[PDB]
Design a protein around this ligand. Structure first.
Ligand SMILES: Cc1cc2nc3c(=O)[nH]c(=O)nc-3n(C[C@H](O)[C@H](O)[C@H](O)COP(=O)(O)OP(=O)(O)OC[C@H]3O[C@@H](n4cnc5c(N)ncnc54)[C@H](O)[C@@H]3O)c2cc1C
Ligand SMILES: Cc1cc2nc3c(=O)[nH]c(=O)nc-3n(C[C@H](O)[C@H](O)[C@H](O)COP(=O)(O)OP(=O)(O)OC[C@H]3O[C@@H](n4cnc5c(N)ncnc54)[C@H](O)[C@@H]3O)c2cc1C
Ligand SMILES: Cc1cc2nc3c(=O)[nH]c(=O)nc-3n(C[C@H](O)[C@H](O)[C@H](O)COP(=O)(O)OP(=O)(O)OC[C@H]3O[C@@H](n4cnc5c(N)ncnc54)[C@H](O)[C@@H]3O)c2cc1C
Ligand SMILES: COC(=O)c1ccccc1S(=O)(=O)NC(=O)N(C)c1nc(C)nc(OC)n1
Ligand SMILES: COC(=O)c1ccccc1S(=O)(=O)NC(=O)N(C)c1nc(C)nc(OC)n1
Ligand SMILES: COC(=O)c1ccccc1S(=O)(=O)NC(=O)N(C)c1nc(C)nc(OC)n1
Ligand SMILES: [Mg+2]
Ligand SMILES: [Mg+2]
Ligand SMILES: [Mg+2]
Lengths: 582, 582, 582
């Protein structure tokens, strides 16, 4: 099948073996930034005709690009860096991918083996450093192990609970000649013998039974359902159970559906939290009962039976004790439960209409709401216009903060892998680079990065990348001259005492600083600004119509606040529904 | 002495205690970027009237700024970040400070103690991660320990071999009220009982004896002499021994002195290496026999007695076996040896004139040299003009690569802490932020950042910082559209096969991309470009005269090569003296 | 309440503070072996009038004695050793206590703080070494922390899932004078915030419901019920559900009860395993689904709903996925379920008589059985006679191997903490020392150690301890000249090819070697031997009647085999029911 590039008996550099290992893995895109310790790999990289490299302007831009790629496709993301500083500049991405469970494979060059542990030029114990922030990592000590390690890395990165895997390759190993054996068996006896088995009809039977015995059932869908979109959908029409989602599960189930309670959590809708607060059957599929969702654990879903299906055993019972658990692939769990539901149809007569109304009233008395002031642009409205003009078919990349929450609240995702946002670690400067990856992974798609002026600038250097790689990335910048989310907290908990949260120039407090348009100009990317709500729709429309890259600097009043809001460690009775820094 | 801000019996937040601990340490400048987990500290920070905060646009800019501060002053550098992503974004700086032995103290907020180890929002085992890349680190588990930990951190960071120390402070510890005890004794029994003692007249006597018995003595000065400038100077006029320096020791001894052999190493002058290759007495003061200096160890200084004085015992004998070692402060070693030299003056009759000539001939037959082509600007010449126009009294910040080597070769440092450059780890994107720190630490000084287009862009966001903080930073950008140092290696070892080393836009190969001037414009920083050598002096002169920030985009032909050059792991007989990518 | 021994304002050595901390913890017995690094503690120990020390002849005898103490009482066990070799000689005990979840506190002296990490005399990184084999450990760095660390150690050792905690105390800290503060609050925010909450009536309600809905229910009781003897008993008479127990749960429920299916597992009764193989409701209380119990996981209890109640969340779902879990104290779970069972009595009408008969038939067709040959002594019979003569009220200590399995099969424990045997790690040489601890903890009890000639000799030096401490320990030695359990495996899987399993003297293959009676003689402990089954009852009777220590060397044919037997990783269909090495 795989047509190689070297004679079956022809020796090649380890570098060449590693690249072929990537080709053999199906990799066709990598984000690598050249450095002395990784030159060989880059050279070997040019000899490949199937793998293309998107050279970023910073290694952090490399990983985030790799995450965007992974998140927007389902394929693993591949980033490559050199030794020392190259490697250290990946840390945030690795930690981010681990926290959000994103399939990733990072390759870093390392000093020659004999030089390791001598404070050699450009060296750092990257395996030591990254051990706690990666799913697993390796330090190649012989060119013979390359094929096996690369296969184990991709296997581990994409199986079970997806996650990052780093492979450290010494320079001398890169230059060493050898005849690769593409048959070696992986050495993963423990991991593999612990891989969940398909769900038993036994357990699934108990769930379908718990459902029929409930009056107030609620689905609590998370990131773990991103691949069971159909299965999940079907399950919903067979049970008619309201669907509340996490920030990571957005898209698994359409937001524009009447059964959709939308997002729950600290900034979830009042009705989604209500539904969970008063439920009697919590179907937690693909979630990890995070604190930004439970608040006070003892008070979370305290009135119902909890069914928790997760691919990671270490997650079942970590914070909430289920009354029914199922360790395994939620996609298969749904597939099985749908069967049972289709057969015992009539004998079940599932009807939760009364529950849905008790809910649809809350959805009515407390819908997501924003306020418009004069001709100022409401960020929510901006996002809403973007939704409308793109017909909600756009891939949305995001920074971290208020804009991130509004980009989640006011856009309606039809499918999963349309929403790329750093949730667990919440890393700033994620949007622009992530957009880059999503675009390369989806050439014919609309890719809009909804950023904040704070986040946007951290990895603004990637604008050079977007231009040179000629990627149609659109940047919907919601500029509010501040570090919004931190600012909102100062207002509500520190009597609005600003502590280094203003990003503009104090010398000219009324001038928009910096002038993001000029950053775009420097990288030859057409840009425009809008201040009046009136001419916002056309602005967004222009951005979309103009071929290629485009930056739309949208100005918003900073006193805006994300709502509703359940303070950290709170209860549904603590939800804040109104007020702003105004 | 220290007038507090809280009643001796008045409880305050841990946050307030930590800041007072910083004031009590003499800290008057910190570089902190606000985040949820560190809000309290930032609030406590606003209540301080002695400590000023320089808010960067990226946490990596925060640390590098802290390094620049430290390096340009001698004081420790203080950077503060939030939990999770804030913390991870410091890794490169910490690793950099450890490798170059820079006094640093980093404070990171952390999630509440009870939340630690639960995959909480924005958390990462920063102490675990940073253990191998820091001199030492802590995880505060009680507000009572703050005073002690902060004192131990500064003590450890600045004593012995300077280095980075990270202190992890949980959010709940920050908000906890207490009465600080500023008397607690440090718990450093092992460390302190191992702190080198002043040099014995015994050993020093043997060195002064070895000197008188030598014919070809050579001083190999390194970063460890940055505080013994005078002592070193005196020692030289009492012995008349030629001074070769490392990239980290530049400035310890004036480059514009006839006894100065300048820098040795991979890119050292042909005469400095010659002097060491043929010496019979190597006086290695404050060096760590790095590979970019020794190349092939068995061949390095293989013809002479090696005297190695280092403050770190783990360094003496790590690569080269001394024939005489002295574990202790080189400043004191010099002080003592100078005494012995002044007394036994006449009876010694130290004269190495013949050696100096055998050398001064090499210095003549092989001086540092560059070539001029038409009206193109030679980067070396540019730097030389900068030297002239600033009278070599400027503080020079640097990126990593060719420009870094030329900025080292063609500038004459009169004193130490005038040359701030990442040597051990060699981190890119170090120059702009480092310049920021050096400037804040030296308000009335000329601070020029000699950058490369590759490095400059990684942390270009710090231009916003420079403007808002109104710092007179000058950026002498040597734009060559490539990743120079990597490019030079492709030329000499890969038949000039470019592998992702071009930073411009392939669509318009002749247009300078990006347009660095517009980046400057976005942040309101006056900028200009020069392409003709003719009008270079005026350009540089303008940059200097124009009050405040200034960016001078200097265009250079990329086929330039740094010379001479001893390939990695080579010998003096392998030194390359000519050729370029032309 | 606690009357101290030092003035509230009187400084004392750390050593004195540590002992008072032990007195304040209720400790009245410790097993310590003096060494240079721990002298101070031993001195401080003599000044205590409440704590008595049982000096062993080996530190391994110290820990095992501490385990026996703990296991036979419920109180934590306290052993103390010196630095270096003293400490290392505890490793096996610590690992043993961790594996079996035994409350233990070990204190080791350490070299002075300043000497740590210098290869000092008698030092070893005991905290580093023991980190993975202890529940938690400490390294005291200041005399001020002694009170707090000791309190945290006992708290952690006895709470949640009991386990070993080691405290490393530097010599200088021991001699340092201070005024102890017995009020300091423990620093266990994470641990404490994660301590299970009492069971909710919700879950308990579901269990009681699952019971009424089952036809073939089976209780799978383990070590975790050792403190819920009554609760468990009551639960059984309210549901009439058969009770199968693990090797660690023996005694929780009386073996001499008709509802008792006895022990299950690799060497469990054929009927206990049958009951589990064909059950429809597995009530796993206080067990950890060990492999010596499940064999092939997919085949274990594969026909029923699994309810698993455990105090350790990390155990629920580790090997078998429950259909109902309850993280919390099984004692409280039982208490709650018994209430529900008493009220809904009539409406439940729980009757499992048919199940019990389907079982009582197996119990009849396949009872535990042994064979008698001529006048040779059957080890099983010996143990049975011991049971009879002691009326099953004796505390039984054990070695590891065949004798251990027979001591478990042929003795009927009425209550928990009557059976002290190393199960998880299965350490040899555990019996004699454990007996010592059980005896000191139960002065007026019959304490018989059923040992094997292999195990008995490893810590035979403790016979000196038994005599000097004048403890009424009886040693029922089942001498078979071999390493039985290993021997049985050679017979069934290696064609009886003996590989170093014979403990006698090959020169006189028929002579019993060694002569255990003479070991007893050396320590002045009356002893006797029996070879004829006929005069066995009187022999055992004598041992019991003779005041004080006594060793009865019982000779048995070695070709005996433990039965039944399900080979490692097997199924109930693989159970071996007959055959011996004969
Ligand atoms: C400023 C800010 C505010 C936030 N506010 C909110 C908020 O209000 N609400 C909110 O929801 N979040 C919020 N978050 C995000 C939050 O931090 C968590 O990232 C999010 O709650 C995690 O949701 P999750 O557990 O569903 O997804 P993940 O964290 O992706 O976890 C998925 C889980 O599914 C399991 N799983 C994976 N694949 C499969 C499979 N095939 N079959 C079965 N199981 C599988 C995993 O192993 C894991 O346990 C916020 C973050 C930031 C930065
Ligand atoms: C592109 C690139 C090229 C390079 N090329 C060269 C080159 O050609 N030549 C070159 O020199 N370097 C070069 N380097 C830098 C190089 O990596 C090393 O950083 C440098 O050689 C280290 O020199 P050092 O040992 O003198 O200083 P340091 O690394 O700072 O080490 C100082 C030493 O002094 C000891 N010491 C500290 N304080 C005291 C005191 N008070 N008393 C006594 N002892 C003390 C320390 O503990 C330590 O062992 C290059 C780096 C890069 C990025
Ligand atoms: C030669 C040899 C042969 C063996 N053969 C067998 C055999 O055939 N059958 C057999 O059973 N064993 C056998 N073993 C013993 C075996 O290795 C395991 O030690 C035993 O199966 C463990 O049983 P357990 O899980 O019930 O107890 P433990 O290992 O003590 O585990 C108890 C569990 O209960 C939990 N728990 C503790 N306290 C509480 C509380 N208050 N409330 C709720 N939960 C709590 C714990 O945290 C833990 O998960 C053998 C060992 C040896 C040396
Ligand atoms: C990146 O550094 C190393 O990996 C390295 C580290 C210590 C000893 C020998 C080497 S090496 O000989 O094997 N390679 C090397 O020095 N390289 C690959 C390198 N590349 C570039 C682009 N510049 C410089 O040095 C100034 N070195
Ligand atoms: C940064 O996060 C934490 O440190 C934290 C992590 C897990 C549980 C509880 C907390 S916390 O309650 O103590 N604090 C918190 O959630 N903060 C301080 C916070 N700050 C900001 C600016 N935004 C958000 O959340 C969206 N949280
Ligand atoms: C056990 O050793 C140590 O703990 C120790 C180790 C290194 C340096 C200094 C000491 S020490 O000075 O503080 N103590 C010491 O040497 N002791 C307490 C000791 N005790 C005995 C019974 N014999 C010997 O030494 C032969 N030393
Ligand atoms: Mg903003
Ligand atoms: Mg360049
Ligand atoms: Mg035996």
């Amino acid at each position: 099948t795989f047509i190689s590039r070297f004679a079956p008996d022809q020796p090649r550099k380890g570098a060449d073996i590693l690249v072929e290992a990537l080709e053999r893995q199906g990799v066709e895109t990598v984000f690598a930034y050249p450095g002395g310790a990784s030159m060989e790999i880059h050279q070997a990289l040019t000899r490949s005709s199937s793998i293309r490299n998107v050279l970023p302007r910073h290694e952090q831009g490399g990983v985030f690009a790799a995450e965007g790629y992974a998140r927007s496709s389902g394929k693993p993301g591949i980033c490559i860096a050199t030794s020392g500083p190259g490697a250290t500049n990946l840390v945030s991405g690795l930690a981010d991918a681990l926290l959000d469970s994103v399939p990733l494979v990072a390759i870093t060059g390392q000093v020659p083996r004999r030089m390791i542990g001598t404070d050699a030029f450009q060296e750092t114990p990257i395996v030591e450093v990254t051990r706690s922030i990666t799913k697993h990592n390796y330090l190649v000590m012989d060119v013979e192990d390359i094929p096996r390690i690369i296969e184990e890395a991709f296997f581990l990165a994409t199986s079970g609970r997806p996650g990052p895997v780093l492979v450290d390759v010494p320079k001398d190993i890169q230059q060493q000649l050898a005849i690769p054996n593409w048959e070696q068996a992986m050495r993963l006896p423990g991991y593999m013998s612990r891989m969940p088995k398909p769900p038993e009809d036994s357990h699934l039977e108990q769930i379908v039974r718990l459902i029929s015995e409930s009056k107030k059932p609620v689905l609590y869908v998370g990131g773990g359902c991103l691949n069971s979109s159909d299965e999940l959908g079907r399950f919903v029409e067979l049970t008619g159970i309201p669907v509340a989602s996490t920030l990571m599960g957005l898209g698994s189930y359409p937001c524009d559906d009447e059964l959709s309670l939308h997002m729950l959590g600290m900034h979830g809708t009042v009705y989604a939290n209500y539904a969970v607060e008063h439920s009697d059957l919590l179907l937690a599929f693909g979630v990890r009962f995070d604190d930004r969702v439970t608040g006070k654990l003892e008070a979370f879903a305290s009135r119902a039976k909890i069914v928790h299906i997760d691919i990671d055993s270490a997650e079942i019972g970590k914070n909430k004790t289920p009354h029914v658990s199922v360790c395994g692939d939620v996609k298969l769990a749904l597939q099985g439960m749908n069967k049972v539901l289709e057969n015992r149809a009539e004998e079940l007569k599932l009807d939760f209409g009364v529950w849905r109304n008790e809910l649809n009233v809350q959805k009515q008395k407390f819908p997501l709401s924003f306020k418009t002031f004069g001709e100022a642009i409401p960020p929510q409205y901006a996002i809403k216009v973007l939704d409308e003009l793109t017909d909600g078919k756009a891939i949305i990349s995001t920074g971290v903060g208020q804009h991130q929450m509004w980009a989640a609240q006011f856009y309606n995702y039809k499918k999963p892998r349309q929403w790329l946002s750093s949730g667990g670690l919440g890393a700033m400067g994620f949007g622009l680079p992530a957009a880059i990856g999503a675009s390369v992974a989806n050439p014919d798609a609309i890719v809009v990065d909804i950023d904040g002026d704070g986040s946007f600038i951290m990895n603004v250097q990637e604008l050079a990348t977007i231009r040179v790689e000629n990627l149609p990335v659109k940047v919907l910048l919601l500029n509010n001259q501040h570090l919004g989310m931190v600012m909102q907290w100062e207002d509500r908990f520190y009597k609005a005492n600003r502590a280094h949260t203003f990003l503009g120039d104090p010398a000219q407090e009324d001038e928009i600083f910096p002038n993001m348009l000029l950053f775009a100009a420097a990288c030859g990317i057409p840009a425009a600004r809008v201040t009046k709500k009136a001419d916002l729709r056309e602005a967004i429309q222009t951005m979309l119509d103009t071929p290629g890259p485009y930056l739309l600097d949208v100005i918003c009043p900073h006193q805006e606040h994300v709502l509703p809001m359940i303070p950290s460690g709170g209860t549904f009775n603590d939800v804040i529904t109104e007020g702003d820094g105004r």
